[PDB]
Amino acid sequence: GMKCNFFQRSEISSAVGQKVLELLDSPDFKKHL
Amino acid sequence: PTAEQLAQWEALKSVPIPPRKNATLDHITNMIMRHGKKEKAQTILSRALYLVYCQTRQDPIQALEKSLDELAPLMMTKTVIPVPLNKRQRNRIAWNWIVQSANQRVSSDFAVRLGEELTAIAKGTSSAFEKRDQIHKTAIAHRAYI
Amino acid sequence: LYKNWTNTTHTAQLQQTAVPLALPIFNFDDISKTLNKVVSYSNKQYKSLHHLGSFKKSQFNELFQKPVCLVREDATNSFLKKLVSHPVKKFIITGEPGVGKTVLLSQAHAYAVDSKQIIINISYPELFLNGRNDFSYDDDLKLFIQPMYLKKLIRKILKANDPALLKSIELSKDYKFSNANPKNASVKPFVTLNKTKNTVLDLLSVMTHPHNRGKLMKAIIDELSVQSKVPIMFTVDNFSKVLTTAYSAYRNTENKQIYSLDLQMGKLMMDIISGETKFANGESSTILAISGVDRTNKTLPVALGKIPVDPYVTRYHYEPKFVELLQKGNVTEFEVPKLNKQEVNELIDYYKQSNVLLDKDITGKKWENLIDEKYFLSGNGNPRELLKSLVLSHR
Amino acid sequence: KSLHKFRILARSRYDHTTDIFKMSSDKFEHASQNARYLHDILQRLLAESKDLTEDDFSDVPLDTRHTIAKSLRKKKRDYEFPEHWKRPEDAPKKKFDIVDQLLST
Amino acid sequence: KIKTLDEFGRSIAVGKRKSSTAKVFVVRGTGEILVNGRQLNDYFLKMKDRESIMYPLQVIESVGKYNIFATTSGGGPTGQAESIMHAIAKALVVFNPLLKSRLHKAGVLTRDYRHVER
Amino acid sequence: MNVPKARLLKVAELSAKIFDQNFNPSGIRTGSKILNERLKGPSVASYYGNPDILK
Amino acid sequence: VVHILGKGFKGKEVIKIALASKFYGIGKTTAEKICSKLGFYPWMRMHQLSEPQIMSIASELSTMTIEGDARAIVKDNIALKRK
RNA sequence: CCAUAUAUAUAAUUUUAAUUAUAUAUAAUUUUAUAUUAUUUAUUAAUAUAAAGAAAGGAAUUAAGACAAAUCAUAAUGAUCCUUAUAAUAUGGGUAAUAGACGUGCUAUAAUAAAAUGAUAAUAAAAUUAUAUAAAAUAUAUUUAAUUAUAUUUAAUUAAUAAUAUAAAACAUUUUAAUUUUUAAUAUAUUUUUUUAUUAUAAUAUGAAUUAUAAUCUGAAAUUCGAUUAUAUGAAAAAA
Numbered sequence A: 001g002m003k004c005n006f007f008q009r010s011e012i013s014s015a016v017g018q019k020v021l022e023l024l025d026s027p028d029f030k031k032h033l
Numbered sequence B: 001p002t003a004e005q006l007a008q009w010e011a012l013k014s015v016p017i018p019p020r021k022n023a024t025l026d027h028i029t030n031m032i033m034r035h036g037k038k039e040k041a042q043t044i045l046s047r048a049l050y051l052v053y054c055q056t057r058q059d060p061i062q063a064l065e066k067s068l069d070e071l072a073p074l075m076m077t078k079t080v081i082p083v084p085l086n087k088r089q090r091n092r093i094a095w096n097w098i099v100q101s102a103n104q105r106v107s108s109d110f111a112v113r114l115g116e117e118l119t120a121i122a123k124g125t126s127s128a129f130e131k132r133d134q135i136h137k138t139a140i141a142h143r144a145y146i
Numbered sequence C: 001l002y003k004n005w006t007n008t009t010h011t012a013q014l015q016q017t018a019v020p021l022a023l024p025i026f027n028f029d030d031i032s033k034t035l036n037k038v039v040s041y042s043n044k045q046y047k048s049l050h051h052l053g054s055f056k057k058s059q060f061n062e063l064f065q066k067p068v069c070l071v072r073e074d075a076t077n078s079f080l081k082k083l084v085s086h087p088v089k090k091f092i093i094t095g096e097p098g099v100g101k102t103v104l105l106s107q108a109h110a111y112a113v114d115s116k117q118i119i120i121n122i123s124y125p126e127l128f129l130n131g132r133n134d135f136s137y138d139d140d141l142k143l144f145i146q147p148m149y150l151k152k153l154i155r156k157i158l159k160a161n162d163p164a165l166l167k168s169i170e171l172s173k174d175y176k177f178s179n180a181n182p183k184n185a186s187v188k189p190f191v192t193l194n195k196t197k198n199t200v201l202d203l204l205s206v207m208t209h210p211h212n213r214g215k216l217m218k219a220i221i222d223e224l225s226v227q228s229k230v231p232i233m234f235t236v237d238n239f240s241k242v243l244t245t246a247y248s249a250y251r252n253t254e255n256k257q258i259y260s261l262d263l264q265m266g267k268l269m270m271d272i273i274s275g276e277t278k279f280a281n282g283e284s285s286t287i288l289a290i291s292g293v294d295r296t297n298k299t300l301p302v303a304l305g306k307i308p309v310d311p312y313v314t315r316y317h318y319e320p321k322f323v324e325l326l327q328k329g330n331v332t333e334f335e336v337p338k339l340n341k342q343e344v345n346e347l348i349d350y351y352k353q354s355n356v357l358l359d360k361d362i363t364g365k366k367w368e369n370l371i372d373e374k375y376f377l378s379g380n381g382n383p384r385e386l387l388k389s390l391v392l393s394h395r
Numbered sequence D: 001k002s003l004h005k006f007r008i009l010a011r012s013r014y015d016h017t018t019d020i021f022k023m024s025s026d027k028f029e030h031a032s033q034n035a036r037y038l039h040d041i042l043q044r045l046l047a048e049s050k051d052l053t054e055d056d057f058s059d060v061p062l063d064t065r066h067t068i069a070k071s072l073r074k075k076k077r078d079y080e081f082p083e084h085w086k087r088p089e090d091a092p093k094k095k096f097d098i099v100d101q102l103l104s105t
Numbered sequence E: 001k002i003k004t005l006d007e008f009g010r011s012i013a014v015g016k017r018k019s020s021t022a023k024v025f026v027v028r029g030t031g032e033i034l035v036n037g038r039q040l041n042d043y044f045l046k047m048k049d050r051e052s053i054m055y056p057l058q059v060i061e062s063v064g065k066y067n068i069f070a071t072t073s074g075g076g077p078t079g080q081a082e083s084i085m086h087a088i089a090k091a092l093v094v095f096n097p098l099l100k101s102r103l104h105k106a107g108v109l110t111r112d113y114r115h116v117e118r
Numbered sequence F: 001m002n003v004p005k006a007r008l009l010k011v012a013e014l015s016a017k018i019f020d021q022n023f024n025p026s027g028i029r030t031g032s033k034i035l036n037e038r039l040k041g042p043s044v045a046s047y048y049g050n051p052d053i054l055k
Numbered sequence G: 001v002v003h004i005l006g007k008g009f010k011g012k013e014v015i016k017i018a019l020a021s022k023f024y025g026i027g028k029t030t031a032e033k034i035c036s037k038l039g040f041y042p043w044m045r046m047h048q049l050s051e052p053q054i055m056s057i058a059s060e061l062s063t064m065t066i067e068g069d070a071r072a073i074v075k076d077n078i079a080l081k082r083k
Numbered sequence H: 001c002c003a004u005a006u007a008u009a010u011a012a013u014u015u016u017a018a019u020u021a022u023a024u025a026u027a028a029u030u031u032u033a034u035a036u037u038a039u040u041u042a043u044u045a046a047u048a049u050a051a052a053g054a055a056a057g058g059a060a061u062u063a064a065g066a067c068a069a070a071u072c073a074u075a076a077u078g079a080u081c082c083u084u085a086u087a088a089u090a091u092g093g094g095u096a097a098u099a100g101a102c103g104u105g106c107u108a109u110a111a112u113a114a115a116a117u118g119a120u121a122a123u124a125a126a127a128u129u130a131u132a133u134a135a136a137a138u139a140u141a142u143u144u145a146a147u148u149a150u151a152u153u154u155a156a157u158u159a160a161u162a163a164u165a166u167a168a169a170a171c172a173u174u175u176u177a178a179u180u181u182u183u184a185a186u187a188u189a190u191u192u193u194u195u196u197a198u199u200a201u202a203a204u205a206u207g208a209a210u211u212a213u214a215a216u217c218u219g220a221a222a223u224u225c226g227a228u229u230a231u232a233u234g235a236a237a238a239a240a
């Protein structure tokens, strides 16, 4: 097997969260708020 | 070879190699030691010998060696025939007697008890001489079975 | 012998059987004749130093008839020349553990004794920081006084110093203390000391009630600060214990640990050190010495400029106030160097003459080999390790 | 002033001993996203460091505690042979050998 | 390959004991010693460790003729002291090969094989 | 240590804003460690092998 | 022998240790708090206490929830669980 | 074949541990010389003394008989039995119950021994980190700080790089019941961190089971039945 690190010198210049919103905007949770 | 180093080698031709350790003191400290705490055993022994020196003002190591040689029995009856003892076995017997005598004293520190016991032995005051005499007397009584 | 080994060798009078030797006597006036020689202290020096507590346990003093000292060019002579020459005489003796900081301090004490100076020695300041003697809040002095320790210290100041010298100082104020002398405690309730009639000796002999004893201490120090006819040497051994114990073991009525500077003794010590208390003589000096038994932290090296100030170091390991006080008074360090091989030769020679060396070393070993071996084993010149390699290495 | 503000705001990502600011990102599924994210963070850091109109943080010293804790975990062999112990007089000296010189001809 | 002193007159040797290793620079001198840049009594608190370190120099009666710059790592105090002892002996052979036999007789040129074995 | 806590709070807030970190000076439990926890469902589910094997 | 609330103490006993040893509700920190309140220094021993100080300790301990009262509270917790 | 010692190669000596790493090769199953003992008479063996050596350990590797083994969980085959149930699923419960008896381990029963403290940080090895690891900091317990335990926030590293993790005993100081062998008041001293005089002055400051209260941790869930912390409690355990 092989691992390669590349060093490139350069000039200077969420699944849970998207479900928590869906649950909170559900009737089961929206009714308590 | 260079001449300076040839001279060094000639000078060391006659000199005996110094001893790594004192075998008798090594034996005694290893008999004090438990749990591989050698430094503690060496501290106890050296502190006791320091007290011996300070109270007798003589080489305490020599006093300890004279004490062990005199106190230890030369032979001992075993199951009943007398058998001779080597130096290490003699030192073990004598040291056990010395420690038993020292643990009858008052100081909390074992070094103080041992040191003043060794001072008393160095001045010819010890009950273990009676133990040595009894062992020798039994050996004489059973000399016929050697 | 019922104590442990250290207390036995400190208190069992084991030197009763030490062979006398006629050493030359310590005399900084005649330093040239005693330089690089083992000397004894004078009789006067011995009395004063014993009362001061210049000698300490675990110094192997019991090996010899009396405590002795090698007069060292690089430690004794150098330090004392600085002590006589420097304009601001405020020193911290430093160096590795067992190097000879306390012995150098005692040589300074002996110099003071023979120089007609008054010595106030706070040896081992753990007595007033460990919470093992009483304390009480004084309302006039906004500080926690410690009457038991003050009684002991005032007796030490009286006993150590030359009575005629200490009587030379006339009091500069009037003082009134509670009378606690048993004979006239009832007939006379207050002892009174007048200006130009009673002396500092009279004040220093006052018997007062414990709650008032703190004021007596102030009365003493103030007096010695105002007089200009006698130099005052103020010495503190194991000063490191003060720098690394900013909060004592005492706790106030609210159960909070008391700051060391809220104690009268802490305030007194750091006032003398910081220069807040000024001694008018001009030959007066302060000599501090660290000890290897105390923990090290950033306070000391920062106060000496050895390392920069790192302001994020926790208070346990860096006390800025002590740095501020030690820098306000221009306290300079004197590092005790380790012994060189010639000094080792002189010390081991004296030890031989005292019949202290083991037979394995003197009887059958070449002298130069012995000196080289013990210079090596002492870590190239540590005096304590030298002694322990001579008298306490039975192996 | 801006360099100091940069280091103060970098906090543990800055190592004063090496002068290296380093940050890593693997929160996005692809390396190109993580690289662009790191570039954008750097831009915000530089913009804030150069904006000294409100606070330059000159009163805040540089905290090196993370670096001290890091250094305690690596053995430090910070010692060199004493300069005054050296004995160049004792070094071996090349001895003349005729054959080699006559062979370099 | 015959060992010799380097450009600074130093004999460099390596010794091992248990999991400890030591690299010593021995130069002619006056019996000075540093271990990991620290004074001998600072680094080695046990006297017997210092005696172990000194023993090879004492064998050839050359304590006081050599400066030792020892550097250790691994294992504990005893292992490090005895790896320094071994390294010093090996380094000392270079200064005078005729003494090797005597050092070999002292036991300081023999690498101690013993190690922790479950 | 002598640095006022307001200065360090300002530093912490500004740094957290720069690096997209939750700044929670009150120390309230936010459940943020729940959000940041990785999904281990795939590795756990592939334990017995790929079911779509040729039979 | 000094007596506090009908408890005897050898003279050499350290107050902060002795109080925590002999009184039911008192522990190490509580005993140290009492000693701090009464101005006793950390390692003061029983034989050094004056009778006024003994009475002050007695009053301070009586204002505490200790001995029979605390034991009754504990037994009441156990009994209420048993119910 | 490991290990050990050495040589070569490799590393742009910042993935640093070059005192290292791991490939290849070498080495020993050591050898020589005398002296004394014996000898199947030396060209033998042992002991001792010399000489050269770094040289001193370990593992694996074949068959044949005998007996045991169905958590034989070291299988396979066969036989036999159940097939609405001896198969299968869910919820809760149990495997943790307590009179005894015994095996093993841990913590103890104190002074050759326990405790506390020790920041330019005494001194390791071998492992682990993509189904993680958790640095520093901050906050609370909590008391100037430190220590310890949680919380907040997740820096770096998926690793000779960063983290788990400043190894701990050691060593030094201080303390320690039994112990009037102590503390304290006065004097006292050329022992001053101390001496002396006169006065007063069987379970602990060992042990940490059990129990109470309040918190915390993991988990959807800690009741039967988990772990941790704080304040209390403070049992048995001494002799042979």
Ligand SMILES: Nc1ncnc2c1ncn2[C@@H]1O[C@H](COP(=O)(O)OP(=O)(O)OP(=O)(O)O)[C@@H](O)[C@H]1O
Binding pocket: C056, C058, C059, C060, C068, C069, C070, C071, C072, C096, C097, C098, C099, C100, C101, C102, C103, C104, C290, C291, C292, C293, C383, C384, C387
């Ligand atoms: N100049 C000297 N002459 C003779 N003996 C000395 C000298 N200096 C030190 N010693 C002895 O060496 C040992 C060192 O003790 P000392 O009290 O002087 O050390 P220290 O540096 O003050 O120690 P610590 O770090 O413990 O405070 C003691 O035996 C002391 O007697």
Ligand SMILES: [Mg+2]
Binding pocket: C101, C102, C237, C238, C290, C291, C292
């Ligand atoms: Mg000192």
Ligand SMILES: [Mg+2]
Binding pocket: none
């Ligand atoms: Mg306990």
